[PDB]
Design a protein that fits this description.
Elements (H helix, E strand, L loop, with lengths): L3 E4 L6 E2 L5 H8 L6 H6 L7 H6 L5 H18 L10 H11 L1 E2 L1 H12 L3 E6 L9 H12 L4 E4 H4 L6 H11 L6 E5 L6 H6 L2 E4 L3 H12 L20 E8 L2 E8 L4 E5 L13 H6 L3 E6 L17 H15 L4 E6 L1 H12 L4 E7 L12 H7 L4 H5 L5 H8 L1 H8 L34 H11 L5 H5 L4 H9 L10 E6 L21 E5 L6 H4 L1 H16 L2
Parallel strand pairs: 1-4, 1-6, 4-5, 6-7, 10-11, 10-12, 12-13, 13-14, 14-15
Antiparallel strand pairs: 2-3, 8-9, 9-11
Helix pairs in contact: 18-19
Bound molecules: ligand A1D78 and magnesium ion.
The site of ligand A1D78 has 14 residues, from helix 14.
PDB class: hydrolase
Keywords: Inhibition, Complex, hydrolase
Assembly: monomeric
């Protein structure tokens, strides 16, 4: 019968209960028990805290009014107050001490995944403190995981007045019988019970989740760790920068702080960072996920020379210039990783830090040319198959769904065959209708299909068709070293970019930091998104934030 779940903020989704600081303060100050509690609610409906919770006055207006109530309550009890006694100090400490109750949030997220309409209903205030930013970030991180956020000070009503419960029901578009409400204050549950809604008194989280488990018939406690938050493309800010007369770069932007530019590889998208973008922004960074030249909404000129590393790096610099960014952290994967290494070698002043996933830094060989080596090692036969313009394009564009369902697979799910050139292509003995890998949903696959409908594989494959050009350019840097903060991350089950091709990188990057991910294939971002986020946020906070 249940179809919606409503969660209180203080003491339910956030701990410790800021309301509970009043008790701990009395004890720590040797004050009469409940003295600070009575000052908080002195007056009831006609009181200052109700005017605060209703939006009639701001928090900074209310602070001097609570102090007066504290002095009038200490008078009737015949007790003096301390000297440094400061309501602002106490509430500042309490608000910043309050953190998200992760197991409770997980239960709500899980209920939303199974089709529940979730919402937050809380008695809160208009925060105009000098430190209001702290609570703003907390509410932002919580907001995105719920369908509705009902704040008392924004609707002019407070719990337990039954009008706010009637307001929640009209917002939910549900009857009381199909709604469960959780709160840490029993008074706030009676009106709800009176309307007939399922109610849960939240004292300890595990017991409440056990009750919620029973009424919903859905496992919420001890459930597996969920994947990090992903992106909905239509919920993102989309940015467009013309770096050149007929070349425009498209990117997705999220968060504030130092700029972090994410560069995907072949044949991918900004969407390949869907599991990193929210996490990195949440960690205190301004994330710019890019559609690399030739991909998605970025321009895809047909000329091969438009995709040599020198031109791509130049354009990334112009991208920073047009955006007003003097520096950015560059994080790349696969071909994007190759791009960021040479960004650090040719434009160090514009690179705050550089990190690569899977892609090692191998200095060019001034003797042998890349075309000689790709033939001297038949393992790179597919790169020879990619050379002839139009050939690989036809195979990859023939059935886009089949293409990405065949490529985006874990290391235990390989469905592709062998030498590619003299076989006929990449999909010669390959399923025409491959099964769905466990790393991706059918919807995520269809997003890639729709992106690559715009320009096809000409631009992306052109990245492979400047071997000699890039080699001559790279040889100009053979005397340099990378001395800015750098991070290399290797994946064990990556068979195209094996972790041993990175073993000599310290020769050219002495202070290079490393990270390793076990049981991880080539598509690192979606294979092990949780581990990637930890390795990157740890390195950013230690080497990029300064
Ligand atoms: C021969 C094997 C099987 C492999 O051989 C090992 O395979 C097993 C390992 O356990 C053992 O059984 C075996 O004995 C041996 O050890 C070597 C790699 C391999 C030959 C492999 C490859 O190289 C590339 C790709 C893929 C490459 C990507 C993901 C694009 N990314 C890159 O271009 N990145 C390198 C550049 C980035 C940085 O800038 C410069 C370099 C696009 C899709 C696809 C073409 C899709 C097809 C594959 C998976 C491809 C052709 C499939 C075939 C396979
Ligand atoms: Mg509460």
């Amino acid at each position: 019968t249940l179809r919606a779940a409503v969660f209180d903020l203080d003491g339910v989704l956030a701990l410790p209960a800021v309301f509970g600081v009043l008790g701990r303060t009395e004890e720590a100050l040797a004050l009469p028990r409940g003295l600070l509690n009575d000052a908080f609610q002195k007056g009831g409906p006609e009181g200052a805290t109700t005017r605060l919770m209703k939006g009639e006055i701001t928090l900074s207006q209310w602070i001097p009014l609570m102090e007066e109530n504290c002095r009038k309550c200490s008078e009737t009890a015949k007790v003096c107050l301390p000297k440094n006694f400061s309501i602002k100090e106490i509430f500042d400490k309490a608000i910043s001490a309050r953190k998200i109750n992760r197991p409770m949030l997980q239960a709500a997220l899980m209920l939303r995944k199974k089709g529940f309409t979730t919402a937050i209903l809380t008695n809160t205030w208009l925060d105009d403190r000098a430190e209001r930013d702290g609570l703003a970030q907390l509410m932002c991180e919580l907001k995105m995981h719920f369908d509705f956020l009902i704040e008392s000070c924004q609707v002019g009503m407070v719990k337990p007045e039954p009008q706010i419960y009637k307001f929640l029901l009209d917002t939910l578009k549900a009857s009381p019988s199909e709604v469960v409400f959780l709160d840490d204050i029993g008074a706030n549950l009676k009106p709800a019970r009176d309307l007939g809604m399922v109610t849960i008194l939240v004292q300890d989280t595990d017991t409440a989740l056990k009750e919620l488990e029973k009424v919903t018939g859905i496992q919420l406690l001890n459930t597996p760790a969920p994947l990090p938050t992903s992106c909905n493309p239509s919920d993102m800010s989309h940015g467009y920068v013309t770096v050149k007369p007929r070349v425009r770069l498209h990117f997705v932007e999220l968060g504030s702080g130092p700029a972090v530019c994410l560069c995907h590889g072949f044949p991918e998208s900004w969407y390949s960072w869907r599991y990193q973008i929210p996490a990195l922004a949440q960690a205190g960074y301004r994330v710019l996920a890019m559609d690399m030249k030739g991909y998605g909404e970025s321009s895809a000129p047909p000329e091969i020379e438009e995709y040599c590393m020198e031109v791509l790096c130049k354009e990334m610099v112009t991208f920073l210039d047009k955006l007003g960014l003097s520096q950015a952290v560059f994080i790349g994967h696969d071909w994007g990783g190759m791009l960021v290494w040479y960004m650090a070698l040719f434009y160090p002043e514009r690179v705050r830090a550089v990190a690569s996933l899977n892609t090692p830094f191998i200095p060019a060989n001034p003797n042998m040319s890349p075309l000689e080596s790709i033939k001297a090692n038949p393992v790179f036969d597919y790169q020879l198959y990619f050379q002839e313009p139009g050939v690989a394009e036809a195979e990859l564009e023939q059935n886009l769904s089949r293409t990405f369902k065949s490529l985006f697979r874990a290391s235990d799910e390989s469905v592709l065959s062998h030498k590619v050139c003299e076989a006929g292509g990449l999909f010669v003995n390959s399923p025409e209708e491959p099964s769905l890998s466990r790393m991706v949903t059918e919807e995520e696959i269809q997003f890639y299909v729709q992106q690559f409908k715009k320009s096809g594989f000409r631009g992306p494959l052109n990245w492979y068709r400047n071997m000699e050009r890039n080699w001559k350019w790279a040889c100009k840097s053979l005397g340099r070293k990378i001395l800015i903060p750098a991070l290399m991350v290797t994946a064990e089950k990556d068979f195209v970019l094996v972790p041993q091709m990175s073993q000599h990188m310290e020769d050219w990057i002495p202070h290079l930091k490393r990270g390793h991910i076990e049981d991880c294939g080539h598509w690192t971002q979606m294979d092990k998104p949780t581990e990637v986020n930890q390795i990157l946020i740890k390195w950013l906070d230690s080497d990029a934030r300064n």
